[PDB]
């Protein structure tokens, strides 16, 4: 009997692909763990093969195995600099904040050795920056330790946002993209899900004009509803019973003033939430998903995936209905323009946008004291970057939730 468990952790090691199906294909255990507790994974995170990491995931290893020394892929991935493996082992469900038997993190690795890249990658997926290793020290600490003044940097504006939402026991995530390239310039949590709440009105507005640039739907086509077909806030609706609206007038008051009943009587053209989330797959956003109607969608309960983005996600879908191919040219400026006449988000970024600036948003708001906005802004009358801002969780006040989305913001813009 040919130990087949072995074989596989060599073929890992000397990055032997199809020596590694073959073993795999015969019964090996991909699982299969030394005396130390390493595993196929471990070796192939070492070593550096990513394509091995990929198959061995894809056919059910164990990405948080430990070994007898509290190393994880993770780690290995983290202090060899591999930053396609830890973003792969991650995407299929890594522990960010793995400790090893001395304390450390692979935010700690990271930050020691000075791998930005991985800094930011790790950051993504909710490392926790005030993680303390068995001296005490964390990420940022050792950063300073060792001259890395570019990761230490990052490690800071990370701690602010993170400090601050603690002390609302929020959690929270944001990112900050280049409207033009889809660079990611900061984030944190970028990668976790959000409740979407009402900033989904932008992407449903996306919908509608893809409609109309395909003939299927008009601007000047007014709509006919009755008083049965108002839902809570409805500011704009609840005045044209009588004479209806246009999809125009529709999609302006759903992104201008938020108005709910508006936003149904859109879904309802294209099929409701599902069909919402079928254009946002043709859009290229598998992560985003529109289940339930005005006002049920704000619900927001924690670990409840119905109704929610992550910012990453957001970001990336509003750069392309902004910028990309599938809206004609026409429509790419009307959503901008709609999205720049919003009035019911005063107390966020605007209030503290410095004069000059471009801004163009949606906000959001939902229960458990959710909060949240997307934006195109800059610095020159024009927009040069998407930022997209989440929090929720923290059951606190309007105002508290207002001004931790603001003080965010300041301090992107101060660090532009």
């Excluded at 008051?253 to 053209?269: E, Q, R």
């Amino acid at each position: 009997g040919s130990d087949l468990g072995r074989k596989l952790l060599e073929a890992a090691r000397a990055g032997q692909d199809d020596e590694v199906r073959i073993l795999m294909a015969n019964g090996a255990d991909v699982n299969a763990a030394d005396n130390t507790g390493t595993t196929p994974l471990h070796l192939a995170a070492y070593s550096g093969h990513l394509e091995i990491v990929e198959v061995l995931l894809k056919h059910g290893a164990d990405v948080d195995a430990s070994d007898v020394f509290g190393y994880t892929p993770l780690h290995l991935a983290a202090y060899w600099g591999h930053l396609e493996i830890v973003e792969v082992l991650l995407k299929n469900g890594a522990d960010v904040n793995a400790m090893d038997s001395d304390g450390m993190t692979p935010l700690h690795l990271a930050a020691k050795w000075g791998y930005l890249e991985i800094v930011e990658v790790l950051l993504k997926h909710g490392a926790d920056v005030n993680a303390q290793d068995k001296f005490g020290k964390t990420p940022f600490d050792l950063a300073i330790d060792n001259g890395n003044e570019d990761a230490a940097g990052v490690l800071l504006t990370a701690a602010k946002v993170k400090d601050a939402a603690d002390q609302l026991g929020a959690r929270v995530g944001y990112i900050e993209l280049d409207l033009n390239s889809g660079k990611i310039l900061a984030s944190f949590r970028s990668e976790e899900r959000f409740p979407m709440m009402s900033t989904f009105k932008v992407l449903l507005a996306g919908a509608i004009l893809s409609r109309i640039d395909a003939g299927q739907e008009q601007l000047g086509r007014r709509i006919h509803y009755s008083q049965n077909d108002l839902v809570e806030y409805s500011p704009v609706t609840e005045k044209h019973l009588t004479d209806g609206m246009t999809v125009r007038e529709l999609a302006s008051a759903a992104i201008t003033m938020s108005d709910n009943t508006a936003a149904n009587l859109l879904l309802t053209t294209i099929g409701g939430p599902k069909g919402l989330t079928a254009f946002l797959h043709n859009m290229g956003d598998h992560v985003t998903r529109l289940d339930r109607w005005e006002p049920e969608l704000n619900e927001a309960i924690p670990n409840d995936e119905r109704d929610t983005t992550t910012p990453v996600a957001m970001a990336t879908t509003l750069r392309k209905l902004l910028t990309g191919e599938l809206l004609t040219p026409a429509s790419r400026q009307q959503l901008m323009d709609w999205m720049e006449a919003d009035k019911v988000a005063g107390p966020l970024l605007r209030s503290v946008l410095p004069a000059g600036w471009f801004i163009a948003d949606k906000s959001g708001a939902g229960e458990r004291g959710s909060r949240g906005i997307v934006a195109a802004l800059g610095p020159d009358g024009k927009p040069s970057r998407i930022v997209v801002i989440y929090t929720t969780g923290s059951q606190a006040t309007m105002d508290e939730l207002n001004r931790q989305i603001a003080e965010i913001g300041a301090s992107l813009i101060k660090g532009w």
